[PDB]
Amino acid sequence: GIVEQCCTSICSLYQLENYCG
Amino acid sequence: GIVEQCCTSICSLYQLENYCG
Amino acid sequence: FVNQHLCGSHLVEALYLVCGERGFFYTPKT
Amino acid sequence: FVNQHLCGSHLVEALYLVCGERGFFYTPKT
Ligand SMILES: [Cl-]
Ligand SMILES: [Cl-]
Ligand SMILES: [Zn+2]
Ligand SMILES: [Zn+2]
């Protein structure tokens, strides 16, 4: 999920925006 | 929903546990 | 507005620790 | 998990800022 995506690699601001809703 | 509740007055961790998914 | 915006930062900070595995859905518009 | 638990704390802060009024959802799994 977000942890696997963004704790193993740097997520841009727009990649984090997917989890907003 | 919690902002009008736990920012108007302090909430213990037990009250915050209600907002857990 | 700013104070509750400042306060909301600590709430999600607190929800992360308390809930743990449960997780949560933070919704300010309610 | 200590590395990722610390990492998740900043994600919760990051999500709150970027999502804001829309809100967000944290699901610790996998
Ligand atoms: Cl503050
Ligand atoms: Cl850290
Ligand atoms: Zn502060
Ligand atoms: Zn840290």
Side-chain angles (χ1 to χ4, degrees):
Chain A
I2 172 180
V3 185
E4 289 74 22
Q5 192 178 11
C6 302
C7 292
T8 62
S9 50
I10 282 295
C11 288
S12 68
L13 303 186
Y14 300 91
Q15 296 201 356
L16 310 160
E17 199 179 26
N18 318 331
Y19 310 96
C20 288
Chain B
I2 185 179
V3 184
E4 311 90 14
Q5 171 61 37
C6 294
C7 299
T8 316
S9 192
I10 308 182
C11 290
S12 65
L13 312 178
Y14 306 85
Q15 323 188 36
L16 308 173
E17 197 186 21
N18 308 327
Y19 298 93
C20 298
Chain C
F1 277 150
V2 182
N3 281 319
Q4 59 195 48
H5 189 271
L6 291 192
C7 172
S9 173
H10 302 256
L11 301 183
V12 294
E13 192 174 15
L15 287 185
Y16 174 74
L17 194 68
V18 173
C19 304
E21 168 61 33
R22 291 191 58 183
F24 59 98
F25 280 50
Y26 174 70
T27 152
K29 294 306 119 184
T30 178
Chain D
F1 313 92
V2 184
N3 41 8
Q4 294 180 332
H5 184 63
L6 297 186
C7 173
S9 176
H10 301 279
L11 299 172
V12 174
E13 165 68 289
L15 278 182
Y16 164 74
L17 304 180
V18 300
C19 309
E21 161 161 11
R22 295 172 54 184
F24 65 95
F25 38 89
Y26 185 69
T27 303
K29 206 45 244 173
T30 324

